[PDB]
Ligand binder design. Structure first.
Ligand SMILES: [Hg+2]
Length: 173
């Protein structure tokens, strides 16, 4: 199941620490259904190069952007804890995605305008998960959120700044 997926992740890593191998990954990405393949890469990133997988993910910003949308918050925080080069990249997508949103006064939420825009609940959930991560990570996340809030003007009233609002949801008194 996830035993199929462990096996497949082992086989992909064994084939990469051996063997292209950026060219292998690119042909696998064009050939395999993307859903399957993102999950296998996720498992490959968590196995006891690999640094070859990471480099290739840094090199393919579209592929990693989909990885970051498709996979659960908690999985993303695991992957990004182990592989810190993926960290500023995750945070940058998150920041970009959050900037796309605006405040719908009638619904009382932050909403996008394009199909691909990330929902508020998803952004909230990704940051909540990142904010419960082991030290080097929790602090880079916190700083990023504060940096953006300060950039918007350090507002505390709701509906101005997504970052004000996210930090209010994320902090508990
Ligand atoms: Hg931010």
């Amino acid at each position: 199941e996830d035993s199929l997926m462990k096996t497949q992740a082992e086989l992909l890593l064994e084939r990469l620490q051996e063997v292209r191998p950026a060219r292998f990954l690119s042909s696998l990405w064009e050939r395999l259904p993307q859903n399957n393949f993102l999950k296998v890469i996720a498992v490959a990133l968590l196995q006891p190069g690999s640094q070859v997988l990471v480099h290739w993910l840094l090199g393919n910003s579209e592929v990693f952007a989909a990885f970051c949308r498709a996979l659960p918050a908690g999985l993303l925080t695991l992957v990004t804890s182990r592989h810190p080069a993926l960290s500023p990249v995750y945070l940058g997508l998150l920041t970009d995605w959050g900037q796309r949103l605006h405040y719908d006064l009638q619904k009382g939420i932050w909403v996008g305008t394009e199909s691909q825009d990330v929902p508020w609940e998803e952004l909230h959930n990704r940051f909540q998960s990142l904010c419960q991560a082991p030290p080097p990570l929790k602090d880079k996340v916190l700083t990023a959120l504060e940096t953006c809030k300060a950039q918007d003007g350090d507002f505390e009233v709701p509906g101005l700044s997504i970052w004000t609002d996210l930090l209010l949801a994320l902090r508990s008194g």
